[PDB]
Structure formats: C-alpha cells, structure tokens
Amino acid sequence: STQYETQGYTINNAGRRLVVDPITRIDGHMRCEVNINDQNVITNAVSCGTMFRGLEIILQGRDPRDAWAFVERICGVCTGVHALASVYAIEDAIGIKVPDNANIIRNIMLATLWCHDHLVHFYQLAGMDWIDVLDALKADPRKTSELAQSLSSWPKSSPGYFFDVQNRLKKFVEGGQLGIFRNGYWGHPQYKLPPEANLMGFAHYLEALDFQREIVKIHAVFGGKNPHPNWIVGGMPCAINIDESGAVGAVNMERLNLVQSIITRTADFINNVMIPDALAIGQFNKPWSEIGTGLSDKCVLSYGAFPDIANDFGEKSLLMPGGAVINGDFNNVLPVDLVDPQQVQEFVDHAWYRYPNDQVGRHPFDGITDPWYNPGDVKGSDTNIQQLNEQERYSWIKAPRWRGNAMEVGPLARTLIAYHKGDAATVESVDRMMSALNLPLSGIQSTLGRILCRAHEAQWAAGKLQYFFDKLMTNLKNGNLATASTEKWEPATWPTECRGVGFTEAPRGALGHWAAIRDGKIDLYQCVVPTTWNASPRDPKGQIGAYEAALMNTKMAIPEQPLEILRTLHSFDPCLACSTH
C-alpha cells in the first residue's frame, strides 16, 4: 500500500477494497473502487470509464458539413449538444455567421434539452437514492394529500389519487416480479423521508416519466425528431413561411403554436412538481449539505452558453456566464480562453492511450487519440479485472486540467461562477433557496447542493424558452425570416487550411470541440466533454478529479451496500459515453 497527500486529502489504499461494477442509473459503462478504513470511512476512490468507441479517429477525412451528425451520436441522453458544438466549431474555422433566427432556434434547442435532461435525471436516475419506494406502501393517502397540498399548488393531489398510485404499486409487487425495484437498498438507515413523502415522490416519478415525452416535441418541430435531431453548418434547415403560399411545407403559425403550448406546460411541471420536491429532499436530508463537497469549494469551471447576440461569444452576449475559480478564491473569477495552449490540456499517464511524453499535457489542437489497453499489475488479469491498479493506467477517460488545476464542471460549478460574478437572478434564486432550508451559502457546495442547483437550472431554462420564443416572434413580425447563411456552404469557398473552436454548457457542464480543416477535409477533431472533466483519472502530480474527491472522507453505514457512493456519483449525472467518445 501507499499513502500521499493532494488537494487537502490523504489518499491511502491500505485496508479493505470495495468494488461497484456496474454503476447503474447512469447511461452505463462505469466502474468505481474505494478503500475504507476500520471506521467505515472512504480513504481512497478510483473512477473508471469502461468503454471507448473512437469518434475522434472516425471523423478524420470526413466533410466538415457532415461532422455534426457523427458527433451527435457521442450521446443520446444529452442529444443535440454535440451537434451544436460541432456546427459552432466548423463555423468558427471557416468564418461563417448565421442569421439571428438560426441562433434563436439553436438556443431554444439547448434550453429544451436542459429542461428534459434535468427533469429525467431528478426522478428516473437520482430519485431512488432518496425515495424509499417500498416504504410508500405504508403511507396514509390522506396524510400524503395533506403533505403535497402544503408544498405546492399542483392540481393532482387528491387522497383518491394517492390511494390509486399506492394500489398500483401494491399490485405490481404482489406476483413477486419486482422488476427495477428488485434487490434494492430499501430500509437502509440513510432513507430519511416519512412514508407519506415516499408516496408523494413515487407518484411524481410516474408523472415525470409520462410528461418528459412532451418536452422533446419542440426538438421534433425544429429538428425533425428526438432523439438525435438535425442541424446544418450555416444555421438550421427548418425554413420559415408564415403568410405566403406553401406555408404547409415549412415552419408556419400552427407549428409555432405547438411550440408555445409545450413551453407553457414544461414551465408549469418544473415549477410546481420538481422545484417543491427538490426543496423537500433538502428539508429531510440536511446532513447531505456537508457530504460530497469534493472540488466544489476549491476549483470550478464554466465556458458559458446561450449567446444572445448572434455570432458573438463574448461576455456581453452569453446569458449563462463563463469563468474559472481556483485555490478556493471565489473573489477572483478568471476569464477562460479555449485557444490558449497553457489553459485546457489533457493528460494520459493514468489512461489507456499513447503520448510521446506522458508526463505532460496536450492542448486539444495538439491532441492525440491513440488507444492502448494496458491495465498493468491488476489483481486478476487483463481480461478478468478484480482490482484496477490506480498507480498505473486505469480508465478510457483522459484527464483534463485548466492551467494544471483539477476542476469540477456542471450545474453547481455554473451556479457558483454566476453567483460570484454578481448575476442578479442567480443571486436571488440561490439566496431564497438556502434561506428556505435555513442553511448557509456553503451548504450548496455538497452532494445535496448539486441536486438543488440542477432543479434551479431547470426553472431557469424553462423561463429562457419563453424569452427566446418571444424574440423569434418579434423578428417574424418585422419581416425577418432568414434561417441559413449559404455563401460559404461550398468547399471551394473555404480557406485551404483553418481551425476553430465550438463551445457551450451541456446539462453536465463545459463542452468543447476543436477542429482543423485542410484541403476540404477534417484533419483533426478533438472533444473534451463535461464528464471527461468530472470522472477524470489522476495526473502526473497525483491530483484527483471531481468524482474521486467528492467520494473522499465519506462515511458508509453498511460497506456491502453502496448507497452513499451512489448518492454522490449520481449527483453529478454521469454520462460515460460522453466521457470517452
């Protein structure tokens, strides 16, 4: 065994080893290992991405106009965000500016994805870590109605409703076919809701499973389908015609009416169902405001997103702010430049890749994706792993750093950056939320805080959907219909050699695509994705990433039941296909 110090942690791999493989209620493809001491406290944590596909290799030699469709298939959960980053990257390289309506529609596509992805995460992925589903069978339906009505104006709250949901669950389990609930952690001492709150949350899990299908109708109108909508370099393909012959062949007033109807319904569900449930989880689980801090009180990163001035990616345009904090100094929000070779770099000394010098980091314009499966001296063998060796290479995930620092990305990171830049709406929302829980601001830097910030952001994004829709309609009233720029669509119009960066804030954090074009073809295409940051393995200094840091120092009630590990990992919304691409 060894022991060393990094980032205020003591990393010690003596003592009992626990393995969690598979991690479930994520997209898939993660392994986690920890060591625990005699006091059932985590003293070492190991994050491993267990798949790889190689999109950066597949993109070589492709037409730049096609790239968005290939990289969209990095992920069907965060569907669309890689297409957006791609068209941004290719437009930056070639020198294309899109019409205002194309930028507005792209912002609608991104806000739609934030609402859908955040809502499904809260209920279908994270919810069963906090709600004891089998304990819902013990609730009194009238007391459940009274609880729900004390928290929200949402209409669906009758005693008869909660009894009907409870009886559906009772029937489901009475044949002994428990399905997704089989062999769960039910009755664990960390389940703290009363039976009435379990029944309320389970009813809401079912309501959200049904409602989420409606949100993505916005993607179907502008992008054809969800999952995996369509886009173009130069704007969007969804031509608009409101008052001319042939409007039946285009985005017309009836299509816009459908979009408006979905926006209103989406805002209502998020504000009256998800927001009060997130606050209720907080009220009943306040100790989790001090568990899972990790890097969130040290180093956080946002690129920024939602340019409101078309083709302007600067500070005055981006509606979701960008910036970086290091060394715990939230009084110094630093500017980020994605072209600077000293800022974003990726290391592979602890990952399954080859570099000419694995002791140094490479900026993505100098990036290399040369896969090399070499797990070294594992317990077991190379095709039957019992324990990864975290002193050597242990993941398909590269290790990104910012100026050499390990960073956390995602909803909590963005909330902290916006709060400390002085964004008025963020400051008001956070202050009101923490006041309601009677918790200090530092309570947001935690596993519970990640969940609260995600709910905050779903509400924010639902409000921005209306804002962008109104902006689109204002242009149409003024006779401004354009959706595509095509003066640089043909390859003969491009520079012989050029490079560009496309960046945004995906639901899980800071996303960048770096592209180089030569002689009409993709010469290099490198992606650094939010879960690549958070699920990162170690670097040559032994610095740990956001998941490994957030698991450090966690108490476990029952070592064989990983509920506390699941709570903290799920709070980041891991997307492992994204992380490895």
């Binding site: 479930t24 898939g28 106009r65 109708k217 109108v221 077991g380 095709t383």
Partner: protein, 263 residues
C-alpha cells in the same frame, strides 16, 4: 405473471433506450407496470454492483429458456474485447451468457443490427453486430438511429398480444414497419416527380416544402416508417422539418459518401 425481459447494453449512445421512453401509446410507464416484466436494465434499476449482478444471475437462472433478451449496442473484438468491460470482463461474455438462456433476441437500433457509428471507417474497436456473434437464436432487427418510439412500443404490444414474433423480411426486419421505403410514402413526392427541388438552404423552394433530393436526401434507398407513422406522437420527421434523410435505418449508411451528396 408478465413475460420476463432482460435488457443489456454494449458499445452504444443510449438513444434506443431514450426512444423507448418517448412512447405515446402505450406509455412506457404502462409497458413496464402492466405488459412485460423489465427484470434487468442498467439505466433504470435500483440495484448496482454486486446487488445488480445477483439480479442478473437470479433472473437468467430462474427463467432460463423463458425470457426475451433486448440488446442495445454491439461488442468490440479489438483489445481482447476490453474496449467494453462489464464486471471486469469483456462485454461479449455477458452477451453470450444472456443469449444462451433467451427464447428470442430483439436487436434494437442500427448499432445492434449492423454496427452504426463506431463501425464507420476506420472502425477502431472492431465493433461487430449481434448476429455475427450469436448464430443459434432468433434475432429480430429493429434498425434506425434510434428507431421510432411508437414503432418500438407497437412491436412490443404485437408480441405480447398475439404471442408470437412479427413476420420479417430477408434481413430480419419486421415487415409491418420496414416493408416500404421512406420515398414510397413521402409527402414531398409530388415535387420530386415535377422536378421541384431545394437547391440551397432557405431558398424559395425550401420555404414551400420542395423535395430534398438535390440536398442529399437518402429516402429513395431507406426502409423505415418515418414518412407515415412519423416521430414523437406524429409531430414531425427529418424531411418535414427540412433536412434530407441520412439513411440511418440502413447497413453502412455512414460510409456511403457525404450526407449532402445525391443518392
């Protein structure tokens, strides 16, 4: 009792699993609660780690010969199969063990059916579709990237209601939804037959809904239900929202030239 279903995931992006939960009729909630018993699924299940491994073993043992195996994604043959690792072993070993006890296999999506994006040139991981590994079980191919939500749920309801597999074409695709081409039920066909084409994005032709053939539409060579059943409760499909078909239901569609080159 409801029919046991085991759903496993190889190299994949999760799009077919997401498509399934978009179903409008029956709701995915009602499929899980009332039509089938979804007994294993890494994306939805409560149990993780050793508890999830115990579920997998218990279900494939107690219901040996009686469960349906749903597969999203595909196995990589490179690096001894360790481009996709499950419980510390090659994913292919979990696929073979799950397949051996199944009564039948549903290959959801172009990944499981043919290869999809990871198998496009140069295929770094040597990703291989399910029917090149499993050669002794019935496999129904349901291709698309992903397949249409209400096609997925209609196939499931057919199998439960009628207690049999759907009739298939010579490639193993259900005749009901894959028997005809996109271009044989496309609402822009009048424009194709008249020579009325979009020539550049957002031109006057585009604003009247003219045909997308000159913009690269692959509808003429693609079999699926997108131009009739449509997507997301019938709201739209790629062509209706102004982009040509990519050909995403067909084997090898990524390597047939640019999406913007004519068919």
């Amino acid at each position: 009792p409801r029919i046991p279903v085991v759903w496993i995931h190889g190299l994949e992006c999760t799009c077919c699993t997401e498509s399934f939960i978009r179903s409008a009729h029956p709701l995915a909630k009602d499929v899980i609660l009332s039509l089938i018993s979804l007994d294993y699924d890494d994306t939805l299940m409560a149990a993780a780690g050793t508890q999830a491994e115990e579920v997998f073993e218990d279900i494939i043992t107690q219901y040996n010969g009686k469960y349906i195996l749903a597969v999203e994604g595909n196995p990589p043959l490179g690096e001894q199969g360790m481009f996709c690792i499950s419980s510390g072993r090659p994913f292919i070993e979990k696929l073979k063990r799950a397949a051996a006890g199944a009564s039948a296999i549903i290959a959801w999506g172009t990944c499981a059916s043919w290869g999809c994006v990871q198998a496009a040139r140069p295929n770094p991981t040597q990703a291989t579709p399910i029917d090149k590994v499993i050669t002794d079980k019935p496999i129904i191919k349901v291709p698309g990237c992903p397949p249409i939500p209400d096609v997925m749920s209609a196939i499931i309801t057919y199998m439960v209601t009628f207690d049999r597999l759907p009739d298939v074409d010579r490639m193993g695709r259900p005749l009901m939804f894959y028997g005809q081409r996109i271009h044989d039920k496309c609402y822009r066909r009048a424009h194709f037959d008249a020579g009325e084409f979009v020539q550049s994005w957002d031109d006057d032709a585009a604003r009247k809904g003219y045909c997308l053939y000159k913009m690269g539409c692959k509808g003429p060579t693609t079999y699926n239900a997108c131009s009739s059943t449509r997507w997301n409760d019938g709201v739209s499909f790629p062509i209706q929202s102004g982009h040509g078909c990519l050909g995403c239901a067909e084997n090898g569609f990524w390597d047939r030239g640019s999406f913007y080159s004519r068919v």
